[PDB]
Design a protein around this ligand. Structure first.
Ligand SMILES: CC(C)=CCC/C(C)=C/CC/C(C)=C\CC/C(C)=C/CSP(=O)(O)OP(=O)(O)O
Ligand SMILES: CC(C)=CCC/C(C)=C/CC/C(C)=C\CC/C(C)=C\CSP(=O)(O)OP(=O)(O)O
Ligand SMILES: [Mg+2]
Ligand SMILES: [Mg+2]
Lengths: 285, 285
């Protein structure tokens, strides 16, 4: 049954169709933000220190693996604050490590002050509180509402309810709220703070992530994946579902182009960058 | 054109159908929170002081009209903090007055510090920052993106995109982020802070407000109304659209019932309470 289901028959075609869609609708190719050796070392040092109180040891290779999503999904042309950039590198990486941990080993009393220390190092006083609150909310939500009936209801009812849940759960709201200081762009800053930024980009991020993590997630009993709403065994049902999802992505991209140029660049680089990172990364194979 | 269209032919039937839906799906009838004479006095005094720098003088009757949405839509069974309650009364009322003002007269330099003063009076340090940030975001969104292509794109594309804009624009995210301290309920606090609370309740709130404000908004050229997505002149198109909105509200209500009992009470009291207030208030006639 579902615990043994797979999208493996569709990997090649779906990858090519995602890329075809991005070339047509976004056009601008993702590029990688470059960090100097010293900047990368500072990020890795900060990640190791954040996760040290947890008794967790993590290799440089694994940190670099996680950080790629930041290097690829941010928008290099628009960056103004590289201190905020390194904070997102660190926040992103330590939250991945936390998520990959056995939940029985989550110690919020040790982890939250580390998240706060990161925010306070890299951001101004105002920004530090916004980014910390988003980080605290993400990690708290994950805990509070696992094995919750709410997750089951939202994830099994309809794509729309599912994506409503993923606005927070896939981490985009947190991403926006820690990323706006990178750009110092007034419009982007407000869209981030109202969460309209996250609401516009959630489907594009989530459909991609869900496709490439489905086999692993389903093998582990995890229900937070939109492809669980269709029978991935029936080639015909799958293809119809996948096309509806591509259509969702396209509608969002087309609406995103109504935003101001800088903001639209950042949103589209995020969705398209995430896909590039996702298909190159060992986490999803 | 659409500027002279009307849903007046449908008022009685739609009102009856909304009520029948709530009686079936929510069941628990809205009740009105009691303020003592002293408490209402305090609220009105605070309202007048906030809008005085704007040269605004407002009658008790007008303030009482605005505050009814708070007295009816909050959940009296679950109130724990009446200071937070009065803060919502004040914040709600002064935001109404701001929104009814000629935009040329909006003076953020004068108004924002008044919003901050209200939050600092009634909330603890942590809650004051969350409520104030949500008020600031709401009022800043309203300004920044008032004649924005984004608003047009979102409001005209699909119901989905429209409701995505209204999460912030109808003010529910702000409502949730100023209301959670009333209840001091951990789960509700978190759903408020992640905006999941707002995402679950926006369609119920927005569909009802939109129906009862359509005629006035369309006469003023305003585009923020879901009934603009159909031809309200065509009775069969309208009835089809209306049913689709009712189905949306019912789906949200049924998913809301998967939340913990206190949270679901609050969410449902809000949607149903707003309907009761909307149908009895002079603002929509
Ligand atoms: C915000 C953004 C750029 C993209 C959306 C997805 C993504 C790669 C997020 C990482 C960036 C952020 C803010 C937080 C990390 C949280 C996390 C472990 C997300 C994975 S989504 P799932 O729970 O499905 O885990 P899996 O990776 O195993 O599929
Ligand atoms: C936010 C909530 C719980 C319910 C929605 C109902 C409502 C009017 C709430 C006001 C309460 C809050 C937080 C803010 C005030 C915002 C405001 C003046 C109007 C929003 S509806 P539109 O912009 O269409 O104006 P109109 O009233 O003239 O139709
Ligand atoms: Mg996944
Ligand atoms: Mg209205």
């Amino acid at each position: 049954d579902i615990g043994r289901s797979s999208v493996r028959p569709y990997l090649e075609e779906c990858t090519r169709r995602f890329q075809e869609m991005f070339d047509r609708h976004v056009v601008t190719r993702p590029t990688k933000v470059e960090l100097t050796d010293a900047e990368l070392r500072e990020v890795i040092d900060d990640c190791n220190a954040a996760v040290a109180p947890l008794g967790k040891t993590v290799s440089d290779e694994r940190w670099i693996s996680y950080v790629g999503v930041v290097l690829w999904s941010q928008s290099p042309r628009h960056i103004k604050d590289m201190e905020a950039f390194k904070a997102v590198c660190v926040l992103n990486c330590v939250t991945f490590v936390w998520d990959d941990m056995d939940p029985a080993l989550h110690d919020f009393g040790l982890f939250l002050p580390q998240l706060r220390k990161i925010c306070e190092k890299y951001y101004g006083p105002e920004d530090a509180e916004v980014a910390y609150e988003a980080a605290r909310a993400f990690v708290t939500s994950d805990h509070m509402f696992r094995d919750s009936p709410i997750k089951a209801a939202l994830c099994t009812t309809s794509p729309e309810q599912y994506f409503r849940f993923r606005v927070t759960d896939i981490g985009v709201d947190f991403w926006m709220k820690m990323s706006y200081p990178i750009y110092r762009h007034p419009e982007f800053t407000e869209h981030a703070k109202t969460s309209l930024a996250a609401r516009m980009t959630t489907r594009g991020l989530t459909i991609v992530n869900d496709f490439y993590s489905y086999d692993r997630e389903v093998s582990l009993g995890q229900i937070t994946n939109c492809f669980r709403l269709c029978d991935v065994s029936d080639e015909t049902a799958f293809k119809e579902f996948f096309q509806a999802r591509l259509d969702d992505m396209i509608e969002d991209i087309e609406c995103i182009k109504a935003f101001d140029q800088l903001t639209q660049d950042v949103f589209l680089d995020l969705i398209y960058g995430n896909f590039v990172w996702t298909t190159s990364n060992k986490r999803y194979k």
